[PDB]
């Protein structure tokens, strides 16, 4: 068809849901990292005889 230009197909609902899910997943992984680090910090005293 002549006289019409096609735009993008970026769905905003999908983008918003993806951002929410990404933020929540990032926070969960940061919490896991903190837990593991604290556990190793507590565990690295056994070596004291």
């Amino acid at each position: 068809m002549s006289g019409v230009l096609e735009g993008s197909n970026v769905k905003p609902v999908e983008a918003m849901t993806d951002m929410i899910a990404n933020a929540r997943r990032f926070e969960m992984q940061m919490k896991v990292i903190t837990s593991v680090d604290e556990n190793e910090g507590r565990a690295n005293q056994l070596l004291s005889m």
């Binding site: 565990a43 056994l46 070596l47």
Partner: protein, 123 residues
């Protein structure tokens, strides 16, 4: 010498504990090396082997006397890492603490035997 035969077992146990302590600390130090395998020794078998040589003959004074000069087993990995490192923190930390305790116990036993041999002689 008969004195060596009495103290041979504890000296060999103490030396083996020191060697295994060095091996465990090497495992701890190389925890972050990718592709490093965690190595260890079987204490009992090596203690048997050490507990179970020919000084060359010196004909005169100028003749020079003879000049003197363990097997490592791989640890079974528990968790598969991506960089190929099989060193586990918890297992080797417990083994390190246990080896330290046993080294202290061997020192105590050897010192007690030497002190008894001494108070037999003192007088």
């Amino acid at each position: 010498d008969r004195l060596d035969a009495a103290l041979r077992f504890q000296q060999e146990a103490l030396n083996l504990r020191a060697q295994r302590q060095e091996i465990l600390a090497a495992n701890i130090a190389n925890a972050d090396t990718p592709g490093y395998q965690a190595r260890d020794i079987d204490f009992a078998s090596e203690l048997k082997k050490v507990m179970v040589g020919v000084a060359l003959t010196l004909t005169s004074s100028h003749h020079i006397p003879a000049q003197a000069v363990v097997d490592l087993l791989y640890r079974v990995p528990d968790q598969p890492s991506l960089d190929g490192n099989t060193v586990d923190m918890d297992r080797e930390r417990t083994q390190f603490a246990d080896n330290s305790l046993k080294y202290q116990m061997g020192l105590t036993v050897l010192g007690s035997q030497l002190k008894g041999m001494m108070n037999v002689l003192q007088g």
